[PDB]
Design a protein around this nucleic acid. Structure first.
Ligand SMILES: [Zn+2]
Lengths: 100, 213, 116, 135, 133, 149, 54
RNA sequence: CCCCCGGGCUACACGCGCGCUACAAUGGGCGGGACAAUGGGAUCCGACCCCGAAAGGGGAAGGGAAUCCCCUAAACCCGCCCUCAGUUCGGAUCGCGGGCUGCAACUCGCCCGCGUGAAGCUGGAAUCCCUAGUACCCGCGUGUCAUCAUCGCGCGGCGAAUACGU
């Protein structure tokens, strides 16, 4: 009877946006939500050598891509889904919803 | 084997390792009195907290300093007793447990053989192994080998290093152990026997210094 | 008399493949179980033709990872080393070996005198 | 009641040492094979040698003559699947030397890579001979 | 009543719980009197020996500690135990005693590892290969 | 009174001394001809090492159960001398652990949860706790600080 | 004639992976389904979103 | 220029740089007792059961990763054997056998067992790196990768000596 929402993004602006949206929805309406819950940030590190040749002292570039993760549970009302599915979902955010 | 009343030892009073007191110990050199820490403790382990501060070594218990000296490999980049002592994989480097135990056994032996407090013994040994040296000074263009006096803190460092090196010497590739060697060194230096590396080098250093006065 | 692990030639010849492979070492057993290949099999056809009649020419090949079987004894096979086809006459004591062990690639080094 | 130097097959081993370590002075026997043989014979390897009864020695020899029949798994043996007979066997010193010799000589007799390396005296397996292996 | 405390030492975390009892102390289900080695046992029991019998024979303490080595675990447990005792007693003589003895009982230790850098990263940040020119 | 109030050394020793009366626990055919792992150099020196190994496996299934064979392998493995190459950690062998656990089962001291590991039974629990009670009564003679526990 | 012009479909080895930008063979970042040489990745990383964060 | 087969870059009287292992008791072996972090994971990680002495083999829950897995690290502690010896130090080289990856393992791969058992007894002239959770000591992950790490990039464990100068 509860629906679970997973949010993933490289930017926190869109995340704050979507989460405040869902909070306003579930507060103006009568329906319960647990969260939002911050999951551990997932970072991808790629370390490579600068030089295109083999001469000179060796120096290394450390490149890092960060991914933030949020979780919510929304209680799965009918108006809930109808008013949640139609929200501005920018392109820098990935959303996945499932049932329990 | 160690008996159980020694393998599982529980202290009740504030005492070095729970066994040996300090109130009956008395220093006599007014130069070294203020740098020989005799605070009542149970575990001489400071976890490297007093290194950054310049004079932070006067707050460390003598036993902890000795343990840290004993925690060594020997003699690299210089010869001691005639030869390099390089172990490099069978050395107790960054292993304070073994040095703790070595010092404990040595203290036990000293107590057994002397019927006194090993801390008093060690104090007199330091007093007798601390040298009162020469260097190179330029009075303008020209340089001379001069004789200069020494400070108490460097005296202590010298004495402790020399005692530990004497032990590492007498335990080198021989049937003797490090604890027995350390006890021998300490008794010898305390009763002023030339059998001791430390008393020997003290006398040699003062001898040379006397020349270049 | 030659005996490979108790058995003679005339016995190894009539023995099967799965029985013979039990006598070899692990490596050759694994190879011979995983199976031969088109090249190796064309060479086997050539050999079976030559040992009786039809084939009246020398047997040359690039196959060096091929294993010496009892059916190959009594023949001469020219194996490539990278530059030339070296003749190898296969003796009974070769059983269980690769043809490349009897055809070397590099020459013996006879050193001179250093330079600058 | 301890013989100070006992005389076992071919070799006059030292009695001042334990049996497991004294038997080690024989070519073809390590500490592990020795422990095996002693556990089969029923002797305490952890005891000072010297009280090695004649019958104990004879039983050790009985075993060393044919270990598999007395147990001794075929995978703890020196020469499994002998090239000429099968018959997993364990040799001590003499046909040991001679068997090394015969193996190398059969490798030379067919003109193989390994035989030629043995002849010239160079590394046999795969090593890189440019920086090390200096006579 | 019950009280809970915590302690940190590099990569190790300890949680202690104190209540009324007889004088028992357990670290990961086992008594502190059979903790090995001696250098860790004395570390853990130094605050108890400073507090004394008339205070420790009336409480029971249980510590769950995980992460980062036996010496770190022992230091963390020592810190937690000192804090729990000081709070449970709300006594200031004990706090003065502990501070004059060692102020890292109640205060923690902030030191962590420095990250490693190239030219022999494995060894450390400042260690490097040697040259011979 | 419990396994947690005494050390593992004396307890494993005494448990191995006591397991010599259970007829379902007997060394197998190949026990005197093997090492305990590839990380080992020489094979065991004691003649009654089977019982010590079984007792340790038993205490481990008690403490850290439910547990299977690979984790016990990891516990019983160790460091290796690889020659001129540097040292690495390697895991132990499995047949010894399997046979030990099967024997303890046949004796009715452990059981397998259908899908995750093996646990002890009440009689095994009583076995261990009685032995520990004996040992603790002995130790209290020396360490009077253990009486309160 | 027309067969001896195209390469076999290798499944493993240095000759089974190219860089889609440069065409190189050897030193290819393999991490997370990415198929780029170290040079090309170091050139186009920010446009994919990687940063300093050191 | 573009493709296929076979060889070579792995050749060795020698001179050098950087390292690994040691020349033993501040230890070797056997059996017992403890204690992490970083990262990664679809024909991928593979718990759990069964075979196998070992390496490895047959099934297979779950897991697209705060859920499952890689993962009970070593140094350390306890007891017993060895007691200053080219040895129970050291471990190169060689023989027989058993396996994995892969279209293919001789040239030219990695692992396991039994045997074999070479130099080396602390190192001249000269020279390198290191000011605190630093240096020394210990092991692990990841990159490369069908298979192969004495390397690079990182991770934690134990943890000092000296100077606050010229
Ligand atoms: Zn490119």
């Amino acid at each position: 009877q509860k629906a679970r929402i997973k949010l993933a993004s490289t930017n926190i602006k869109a995340l704050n946006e979507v989460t405040d949206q869902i909070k306003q929805i579930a507060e103006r309406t009568g329906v319960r939500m647990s969260g939002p819950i911050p999951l551990p940030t997932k970072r991808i590190r790629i370390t490579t050598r600068k030089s295109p040749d083999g001469e000179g002292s060796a120096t290394f570039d450390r490149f890092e891509l960060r991914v933030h993760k949020r979780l919510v549970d929304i209680e799965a009302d009918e108006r809930a889904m109808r008013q949640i599915m139609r929200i501005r979902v920018p392109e820098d955010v990935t959303i996945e919803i499932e049932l329990i | 084997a160690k008996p159980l009343t020694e393998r599982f030892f529980i202290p009740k009073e504030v005492k070095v390792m729970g066994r040996w007191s300090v109130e009956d110990v008395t220093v006599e050199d007014p130069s070294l009195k203020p740098y020989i820490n005799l605070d009542a403790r149970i575990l001489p382990h400071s976890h490297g907290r007093y290194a950054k501060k310049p004079f932070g070594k006067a707050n460390v218990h003598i036993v902890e300093r000795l343990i840290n000296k004993v925690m060594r490999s020997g003699a690299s980049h210089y010869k001691a007793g005639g030869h390099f002592m390089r172990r490099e994989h069978r050395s107790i480097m960054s292993k304070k447990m073994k040095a703790y135990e070595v010092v404990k056994e040595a203290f036990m032996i000293i107590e057994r053989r002397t019927k006194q407090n090993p801390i008093q013994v060690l104090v007199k040994a330091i007093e007798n192994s601390a040298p009162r040296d020469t260097t190179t000074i330029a009075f303008g263009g020209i340089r001379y080998h001069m004789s200069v006096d020494v400070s108490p803190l460097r005296r202590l460092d010298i004495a402790l290093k020399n005692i530990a090196l004497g032990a590492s010497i007498k335990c080198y590739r021989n049937k003797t152990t490090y604890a027995q060697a350390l006890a021998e060194e300490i008794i010898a230096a305390a009763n002023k026997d030339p059998k001791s590396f430390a008393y020997s080098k003290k006398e040699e250093i003062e001898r040379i210094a006397q020349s270049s006065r | 008399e030659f005996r490979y692990r108790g058995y003679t030639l005339d016995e190894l010849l009539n023995m099967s493949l799965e029985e013979f492979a039990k006598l070899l070492p692990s490596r050759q057993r694994r190879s011979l179980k995983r199976g031969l290949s088109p090249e190796q099999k064309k060479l086997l056809r050539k050999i079976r033709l030559a040992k009786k009649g039809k084939y009246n020419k020398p047997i040359r090949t690039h196959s060096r990872d091929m294993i010496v079987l009892p059916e190959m004894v009594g023949m001469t096979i020219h194996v490539y080393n990278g530059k030339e086809f070296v003749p190898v006459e296969i003796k009974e004591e070769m059983i269980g070996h690769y043809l490349g062990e009897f055809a070397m690639t590099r020459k013996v080094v006879q050193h001179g005198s250093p330079g600058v | 009641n301890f013989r100070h130097i006992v005389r076992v097959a071919g070799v006059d081993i030292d009695g001042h040492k334990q049996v497991r370590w004294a038997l080690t002075g024989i070519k073809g026997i390590g500490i592990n094979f020795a422990t095996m043989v002693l556990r089969v014979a029923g002797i305490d390897p952890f005891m000072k040698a010297g009280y090695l009864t004649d019958e104990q020695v004879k039983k050790i020899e009985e075993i060393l003559a044919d270990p598999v029949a007395h147990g001794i798994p075929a995978w703890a043996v020196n020469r499994p699947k002998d090239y000429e007979t099968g018959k997993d066997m364990h040799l001590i010193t003499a046909k040991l030397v001679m068997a090394w010799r015969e193996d190398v000589n059969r490798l030379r007799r067919i003109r193989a890579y390994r035989g030629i390396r043995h002849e010239l005296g160079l590394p046999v397996r795969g090593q890189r001979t440019r920086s090390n292996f200096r006579h | 009543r019950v009280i809970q405390t915590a302690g940190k030492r590099k990569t190790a975390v300890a949680r202690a719980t104190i209540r009324e009892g007889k004088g028992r102390v357990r670290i990961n289900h086992k008594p502190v009197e059979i903790i090995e080695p001696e250098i860790a046992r004395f570390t853990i029991m130094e605050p108890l020996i400073l507090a004394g019998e008339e205070i420790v024979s009336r409480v029971d303490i249980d510590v769950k500690v995980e992460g980062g080595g036996f010496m770190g675990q022992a230091e963390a447990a020592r810190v937690a135990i000192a804090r729990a005792l000081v709070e449970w007693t709300n006594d200031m003589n004990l706090k003065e005693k502990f501070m004059k003895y060692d102020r890292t009982m109640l205060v923690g230790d902030s030191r962590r590892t420095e990250p490693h850098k190239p030219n022999r990263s494995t060894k450390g940040p400042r260690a490097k290969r040697q040259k011979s020119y | 009174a419990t396994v947690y109030d005494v050390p593992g050394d004396l307890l494993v020793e005494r448990v191995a001394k006591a397991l010599k009366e259970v007829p379902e626990i007997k060394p197998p055919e190949w026990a005197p001809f093997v090492k305990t792992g590839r990380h080992k150099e020489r094979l065991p020196e004691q003649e009654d090492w089977w019982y010590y190994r079984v007792a340790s496996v038993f205490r481990k299934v008690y403490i850290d159960g439910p547990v299977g064979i690979e984790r016990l392998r990891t516990w019983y493995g160790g460091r290796k001398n690889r020659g001129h190459a540097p040292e690495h950690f390697y895991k132990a062998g499995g047949s010894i652990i399997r046979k030990a656990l099967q024997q303890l089962e046949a004796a009715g001291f452990v059981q397998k949860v259908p899908g995750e590991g093996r646990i002890v039974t009440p009689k095994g629990q009583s076995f261990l706790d009685k032995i520990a009670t004996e040992l603790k009564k002995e130790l209290e003679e020396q360490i009077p600080e253990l009486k309160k526990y | 004639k027309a067969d001896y012009n195209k390469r076999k479909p290798r499944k493993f080895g240095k000759g089974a992976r190219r860089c889609m930008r440069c065409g190189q063979y050897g030193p290819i970042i393999r991490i997370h389904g990415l198929m780029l040489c170290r040079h090309c990745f170091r050139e186009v990383a920010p446009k994919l979103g990687f940063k300093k964060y050191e």
